[PDB]
Amino acid sequence: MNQERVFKVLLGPHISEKATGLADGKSQFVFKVATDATKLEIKKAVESLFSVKVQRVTTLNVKGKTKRTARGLGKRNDWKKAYIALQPGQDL
Amino acid sequence: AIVKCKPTSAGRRFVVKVVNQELHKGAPYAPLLEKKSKSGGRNNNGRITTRHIGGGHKQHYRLVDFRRNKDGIPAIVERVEYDPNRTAHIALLKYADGERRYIIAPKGVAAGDQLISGIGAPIKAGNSMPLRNIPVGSTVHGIELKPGKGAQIARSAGASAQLVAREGAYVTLRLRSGEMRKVLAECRATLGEVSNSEHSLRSLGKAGATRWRGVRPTVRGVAMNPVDHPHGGGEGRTSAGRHPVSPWGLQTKGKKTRSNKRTDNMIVRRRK
Amino acid sequence: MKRTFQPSTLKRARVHGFRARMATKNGRQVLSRRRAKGRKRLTV
């Protein structure tokens, strides 16, 4: 990242029960990221934005669900999730 | 060195093995080895083209020096080894400059013998020289046909040729086939007989030993149906029912098949 | 009882996939035929 790509990397926080439990207990925050966002681009984006210090980023790709309904077998988009751990003081 | 096995089981009865205890017990010479992947006797096209080939033992090819062209430099035999590629034994020559090579072992050659090739090579039964320097009457093996091409004629175990006549530029050899052939006197040959002459005395005892050597079974033509073989067909056990032929229809009792007009001048008298 | 279909996606790809078809001229004809008929799936 060396451009306006910083604004196209993080798609938004993930609002699961596992996400909030991770935010409270540990200092990890689950974000939705672009499917072609590397772990380095996510770390830089969360540091430029949100003005925090990132300790480690782990990512995983999530398969979109199919839901064969209503004259055919549809399919939701594949999406990427990032677990972002900061320093203990920071809360993002 | 011919050993008959005791009949401790069926399949061991009639096993007669050639056990040469003078052979090397260790590994072959690695710099002279090379990968040799098997075919099932199969073609460029993946077609068989040669029946009864398949499923033997993995074998390294040994780079045998057929053109003994290191003239002048003496060699020490220093080892005789088993070769899975041929019925003859091979000897690992160590030349005076330290270069190591593989040659077909002559009959009496053992480790420590001195071999030399060239014009002035002494006449002893391990040496190589052009056929013009070999006296008439000598027994030779590993004879070239084209100068520089390498040994081609007497190479299998026990093989030898007889130098019978010498004209101007050609030498007449008597092959173990009984054919009298003309060879250029410039071509090289090695004096003496090839080793492992008792290889013909061996008896495999069982169907498995033939399979160990990569030979698949032969099915007789009379055992087939007419669609597969000219000899096929017949109610009950029947003979060929016709003059015997190959599966492709060529007569196989007599019926000479040589059709090489180019090389006919090299054959003095013909025998097979 | 072993049945005739023993799936292997690697073997399936190498025998019937898009690049296997495009490699030959009769394979390109299959893709032309299946495009002309309008098949949603072109290869497997």
Next chain:
RNA sequence: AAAGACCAAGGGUUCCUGCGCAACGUUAAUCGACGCAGGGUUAGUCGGUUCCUAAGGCGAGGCUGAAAAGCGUAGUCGAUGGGAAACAGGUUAAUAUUCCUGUACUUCUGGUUACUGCGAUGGAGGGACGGAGAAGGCUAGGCCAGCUUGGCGUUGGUUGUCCAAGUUUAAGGUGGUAGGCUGAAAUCUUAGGUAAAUCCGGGGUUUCAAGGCCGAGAGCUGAUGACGAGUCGUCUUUUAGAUGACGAAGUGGUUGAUGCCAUGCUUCCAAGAAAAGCUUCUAAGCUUCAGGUAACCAGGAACCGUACCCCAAACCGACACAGGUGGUCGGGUAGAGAAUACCAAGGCGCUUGAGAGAACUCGGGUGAAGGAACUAGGCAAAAUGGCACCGUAACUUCGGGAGAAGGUGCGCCGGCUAGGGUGAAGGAUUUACUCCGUAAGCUCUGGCUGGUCGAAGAUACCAGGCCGCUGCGACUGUUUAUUAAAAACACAGCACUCUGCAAACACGAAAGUGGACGUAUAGGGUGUGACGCCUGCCCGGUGCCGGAAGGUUAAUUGAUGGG
């Protein structure tokens, strides 16, 4: 030795939670691999990717081919193989060698310092490997004892030689052991390693013999840690899910792998990948440079997979189908055992039930007297069955036949008695992961006697029926997937014949390829079919081989005649 737990393939959300039951589920369904919605898969070390190649593919030019194309060189792909490194504990409804805690390891990048000849597409080494067998050394695991905690038994006894549970702990570091391999060093020189080499190979001297490489495992550390029945918080909350601190013992002996040393060792013949990474040597180049080496500091290790099923209801079989599906782990008692029986850890009772207790069918148990009279035929059944010991015929190719046949003993409890192994002591080498040895204790194998119970002691499961004559095929093997397993096919052995290498022969309009990186003791085709004794007569027919005096005979040529 799975109907348990996994890895792979295959599938693809079936995983978990809330709501739900129309259809799906061979019944009902509140339940579900079903419907709706939400959630869930976290890696420098696992597996890929990336590096390297096998078979094989494609293949610039090229060669060949009416065209389409075929083949193939340089190359470039292609794992099922080779090539860096991670373990334990905790934790979710659902992920974890990935998150957290703790302790490691590997490999890169940047900078600073100090020293310095660096550099491949090449040379050398290395990587790097078969079958079988053996006897060791370990380890996991098992068992016993001791210890800790708890218990004192609805019915005789049970404060004891009693009962129950627990008694755990990895990678890494250190160590260089059991054990395996190999003589080492200096100097001089050199037809070799396509060129060069200081490296390798060869040759000649001198010295010393002990230097080097590999290597399970032990011990120590990792670990004052973690784990640990439970105790105290008891918010609760009934079924005791969680809730957060503490938490005892945590030691010896023996047995012991199919796992590791071991890619070792011995032996055999059928003679046992490749390439790279890696080490080293130089060439072109580069010469204050670059580059290399070592130390320190700083930082990094991207991308993809990860849920779930996986002898299965989620894969292949149209099905929630008695079938098929590669690899790994595999505890206890008995047992030779991965057989078998009963159990463990775990997982299940197989998605219609309820009765009744006819014929008949299926699958079994027992059976008077007889005992193959059945039947095409002892089909089926019944029977035999283990170990040790005694004993064992014709015939034989001397190996066999043979477990021939047949017989005896076998449980349990005592008395006496012979040896394995391990093993504190002690001694030695009181050099050290050393050797000898060791009482007790554990553990294994026996011998001789006596008693005793039952109808019966190889008591269950498990576990040969045997003999005689004869046909065929020598034998192990193979075969009609789905009515034929055979005397058929193969086979070792035998013989005939072809083939002189650009081999015969085969596939290919061809190039080329197989034969074969083989060379007549070889290769092809044909027949016969171990072995033993043998294999007789016929060359008229047909084929094949050899010969060429004569006859006949193609295209071709075109004398002559007739138009």
